[PDB]
Symmetry: C3
Subunit: 76 residues, 3 copies
């Protein structure tokens, strides 16, 4: 049913939001170490963490878009 | 408000979501080449791809916000 | 009330979207300066701006998720 599917998708959004925090923290830390001890490797490692962070945002947006579609169906 | 405007906005969101996919994949491909052959230019090119990727996310979020506003009007 | 809380949350979202604009512009500017005069420092500074930009996106998604939860409660 619509209420169940929406509840499930929202719980999914919570989980994704949770990874996003752990990633944001992990990323803010590397950026701290990067500026403190800059180097080519430090830059590449920081870029890799940024990409991992962007991809988590993308998953977050994917779930948001799924919730929007479910809400639009529910209010029809 | 209208079912038509929401339908159209959700189709917009899908188009933006599609760019995001093409951008996320291409970003990950470049990140692979970066780690394989790190260099000044490799890093700079990687940053450019990340910025283009973040800008697509921003557009995605913009459409999400428009859909939210339309839903809020429709349910009043 | 539901209508008030949703109105307030959307105003929050708009303020965050505004911050996102200012970050996107400032970020793209550094990316222009970076490619023109690349250097280790230029790269580290660009990475800092990108992270600050990603963090605003995260705030934006946070508000979006709050609005979704308010809408789901309003249509029950």
């Amino acid at each position: 049913g619509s209420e169940y599917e929406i509840r499930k998708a929202l719980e999914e959004l919570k989980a994704s939001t949770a990874e996003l925090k752990r990633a944001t923290a992990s990323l803010r830390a590397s950026t701290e170490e990067l500026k403190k001890n800059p180097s080519e490797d430090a830059l590449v490692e920081n870029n890799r963490l940024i990409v991992e962070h962007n991809a988590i945002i993308v998953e977050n947006n994917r779930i948001i878009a799924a919730v929007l579609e479910l809400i639009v169906r529910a209010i029809k």
